[PDB]
Amino acid sequence: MDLKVVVSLSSRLYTDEIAKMQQRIGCILPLASTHGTQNVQGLGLGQVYSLETVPDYVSMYNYLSDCTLAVLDEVSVDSLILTKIVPGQTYAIKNKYQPFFQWHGTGSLSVMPPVFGREHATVKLESNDVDIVFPMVLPTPIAEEVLQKILLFNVYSRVVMQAPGNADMLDVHMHLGSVSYLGHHYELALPEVPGPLGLALLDNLSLYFCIMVTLLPRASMRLVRGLIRHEHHDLLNLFQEMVPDEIARIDLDDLSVADDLSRMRVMMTYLQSLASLFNLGPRLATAAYSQETLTATCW
């Protein structure tokens, strides 16, 4: 019910880094194991993310969700005082990310690996030959958008192999490259080569997709095939007057409510399971916020 964790440093502070660490007060980082005394290298995210190593971000998500998360509380010349995240406790939080994102009230926050920039969220302590890597806390919308972009890139990279360069320039860096915000645009770091352990999510995705596409309903296809041709809609701006003929080929047979209903039941049941393969991030609920202090109360 009361948890205070001290991490001891063998070497000294080396004040060159302490100022940057001190304006870095009150922010999250995941620690290795829950004990009163910790090792210095297990403290940051520096273990999972080596400088020479190519980033595979689903592995970073897997490491990040497993480890306990801690609130930085105070840096001392030889000490790191951090209270941790008890699952049933409420505490304040204050954040400053160099990719700076503005929060709303009662908006759930997701914890993610620092996909944007290594120099940004990582502080090198070469005195111990270590590097403290802070994780990224974002509002849930932008979090799921960025994760989806990451997985779609991990697919289309395997796809765009041996295709015209017009595939190489466009899909690889038009939508999978940048993430927008209100009058703002942030680039992403992209894995030069497709990463293993990322598609391990995609295999399960393909499984669910096979099972779901075995049980798709019929009437919805008829409604859409009618509405694209007879009427105009903004959601139907995507489809032009021409229809993908796949829908025409599946559509051929008549309707029956008794068939649609059991398909709908099993489709609903297979839709509750996707939330496990889509979250991959510990979520924090907002209770109150002040832009004048940038200090919210997450939960």
């Binding site: 192999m161 041996q162 015209p164 360069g165 190489d168």
Partner: protein, 292 residues
């Protein structure tokens, strides 16, 4: 035989009819010497005995396996006159094109797996048949195509020598031993160089890749070199990229092509001769259909 049911769901996408196959390892040893790479990337192509061609069906991504017969070693699993082409590769840059002639796939499906003769390489190829479901011109086109293109490059080099009053200079600062007094017969240098330049032909030569450039910005700063040994002391290497050492090492004839149509003949001793590259829209288009 799992990749065969893996294909047939979406196999109808690219091509109307296909033939299942299996390739021995000694047969692949023509493509990928000094290596036994997997073939997960390996993407096929198609080829017709006329000007028309269609490619890029990308038939099968197939793992290695032993054959169902016990005495089948460890081979790689996967008009009666044409040169059907296949292209194997992996995640890396280890790519190889193999030829297949009909009368081996049509007659080879005789009767559920059977060996057939391979005309291009003197070894057997195994064909599996699912039980429930102008002869010399066709291989001779690519050869004379590339030969005439290289000869055009050679004629350009000769005219550029004519422009220089039949003399040469250096463009790569490598200090020669200065002991060249007809040692190595300085004329024999260019005789054997032109020997190897005009004799050698490969679909993956430097100017092939240099003709087909993805961008305007990068390939201007990019060079495509290939250096081959003097007097056939070894095998040749094609298509090295320059993001010099090759002027230093003797007994290596160096050929460097730009994206703009410049060719450069480098001799041992750093001397450089310039030539021009010219391809009509038809040959450019044929090479773009092949390589791209």
């Amino acid at each position: 035989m799992d990749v065969h049911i893996d294909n047939q769901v979406l196999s109808g996408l690219g091509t109307p009819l296909l033939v299942h196959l299996f390739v021995p390892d000694t047969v692949m040893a023509e493509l990928c010497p000094n290596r036994v790479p997997n073939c997960e990337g390996a993407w096929c192509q198609t080829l017709f005995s006329d000007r028309t061609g269609l490619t890029r069906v990308c038939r099968v991504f197939a793992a290695r396996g032993m054959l169902p017969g016990r005495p089948s070693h460890r081979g790689t699993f996967t008009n009666p006159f044409h040169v059907a082409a296949l292209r194997f590769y992996d995640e890396g840059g280890l790519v190889g094109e193999l030829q297949i002639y009909y009368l081996s796939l049509f007659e080879g499906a005789k009767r559920l797996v059977r060996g057939i003769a391979h005309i291009f390489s003197p070894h057997a190829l195994y064909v599996v048949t699912y039980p429930e479901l102008s002869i010399l011109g066709a291989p001779e086109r690519e050869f004379r195509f590339l030969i005439s293109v290289a000869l055009r490059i050679s004629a350009s080099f000769r005219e550029k020598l004519a422009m220089q009053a039949w003399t040469a200079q250096q463009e790569i600062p490598v200090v020669i031993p200065t002991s060249y007094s007809r040692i190595y017969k300085n004329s024999d240098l260019i005789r054997e160089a032109f020997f190897t330049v005009q004799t050698r032909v490969s679909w993956e030569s430097c100017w092939v890749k240099a003709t087909i450039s993805n961008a305007p910005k990068t390939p201007d700063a990019c060079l495509w070199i290939d250096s081959h040994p003097l007097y056939e002391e070894g095998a040749s290497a094609w298509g090295k990229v320059i993001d010099v050492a090759l002027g230093t090492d003797g007994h290596c004839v160096h050929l460097a092509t730009t994206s703009d149509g410049q060719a450069f003949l480098v001799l041992p001793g750093g001397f450089v001769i310039k030539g021009q590259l010219a391809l009509t829209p038809e040959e450019r288009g044929y090479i773009l259909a092949r390589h791209g």
